[PDB]
Every structure is written in structure tokens, then in C-alpha cells.
């Protein structure tokens, strides 16, 4: 019915009607970082 | 390093990199290193060239090639 990875987590699922398998990729995450200069000179920042 | 690119690494460096043979977990993430390995290879090549050319005048002004046999004799 479905597959799993080396970490024993769901990795692919087949559709019962159209018997073809579908991949699963978790929704993107990650931390944010704020690049700033000294407040002595400006208040303009860039983010990554 | 060989100018016939891609040859930024020497033969031995390529052999080592091949010998070494060089997410989903929700919370776990791997950040990239600040210095790419191209920069590390460039640093190593610069050090090697400096120590092979300048001899005992590596770091100062110099800017001339000391003969290798002289360094070997020293
Ligand atoms: C920057 O500002 C802070 C306070 O806003 C002050 O303590 C510091 O001395 C200043 N430094 C410079 C280089 O202007």
C-alpha cells in the first residue's frame, strides 16, 4: 500500500483508484537570519 | 594544481576526495560551511607555491624565485 524510508517514515503513497504511487515531501521549514549594520549609521536591514 | 580544468585540485586531492566518497527530520537541519572547498584548495595551493618559490623569504617583500637546490642545501 505504501513505502517507507531508512528512518521508518512514510515516503510514498499509492492512489487506490489510479494505482500509481505518489511521493511525499514535507513542507519547507528553516530559521530566519537578520543581517544588520550598526544602528549608529543606518536602520536598513536585509534578511536571509 | 593542473591548469587543464577541471583540475583545481591535484591528483592526490582528487584521490582523497574519491576515497572519502564526498532534510525530512522536521527540526533537524544542516548548515553549509562558510568556506567552500574551492577556497580551501586555493589556500593550500597558495601556501604550497609560496613555500616552493620564495624559500626562506616567504612573507616579506622578496618577490623573486630562490633556486630550489639552494633551499635543499640549506
Ligand atoms: C553607537 O551608539 C551607541 C548608543 O546608541 C554608543 O554607545 C556608541 O558609542 C556609538 N558608537 C559609535 C561608533 O558611534
From Swiss-Prot, chain A:
Changing residue 7 to D: In strain: Alpha/B.1.1.7. Glycans are attached at residue 40. Binds to host ACE2. RBD also interacts with the N-linked glycan on 'Asn-90' of ACE2. Cleavage of S generates a polybasic C-terminal sequence on S1 that binds to host Neuropilin-1 (NRP1) and Neuropilin-2 (NRP2) receptors. Interacts with host integrin alpha-5/beta-1 (ITGA5:ITGB1) and with ACE2 in complex with integrin alpha-5/beta-1 (ITGA5:ITGB1). May interact via cytoplasmic c-terminus with M protein. May interact (via N-terminus) with host bilirubin and biliverdin, thereby preventing antibody binding to the SARS-CoV-2 spike NTD via an allosteric mechanism. Attaches the virion to the cell membrane by interacting with host receptor, initiating the infection. The major receptor is host ACE2. When S2/S2' has been cleaved, binding to the receptor triggers direct fusion at the cell membrane. When S2/S2' has not been cleaved, binding to the receptor results in internalization of the virus by endocytosis using host TFRC and GRM2 and leading to fusion of the virion membrane with the host endosomal membrane. Alternatively, may use NRP1/NRP2 and integrin as entry receptors. This is Spike protein S1. It comes from Severe acute respiratory syndrome coronavirus 2.
Amino acid at each position: 500500500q505504501f513505502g517507507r524510508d531508512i528512518a521508518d517514515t512514510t515516503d510514498a503513497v499509492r492512489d487506490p483508484q489510479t494505482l500509481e504511487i505518489l511521493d511525499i515531501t514535507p513542507c519547507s521549514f528553516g530559521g530566519v537570519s537578520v543581517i544588520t549594520p550598526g544602528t549608529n549609521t543606518s536602520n536598513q536591514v536585509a534578511v536571509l | 594544481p593542473d591548469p587543464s580544468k577541471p583540475s583545481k585540485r591535484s591528483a592526490i586531492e582528487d584521490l582523497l576526495f574519491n576515497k572519502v566518497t564526498l532534510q525530512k527530520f522536521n527540526g533537524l537541519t544542516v548548515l553549509p560551511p562558510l568556506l567552500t572547498d574551492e577556497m580551501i584548495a586555493a589556500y593550500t595551493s597558495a601556501l604550497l607555491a609560496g613555500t616552493i618559490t620564495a624559500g626562506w623569504t616567504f612573507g616579506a617583500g622578496a618577490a623573486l624565485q630562490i633556486p630550489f637546490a639552494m633551499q635543499m642545501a640549506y
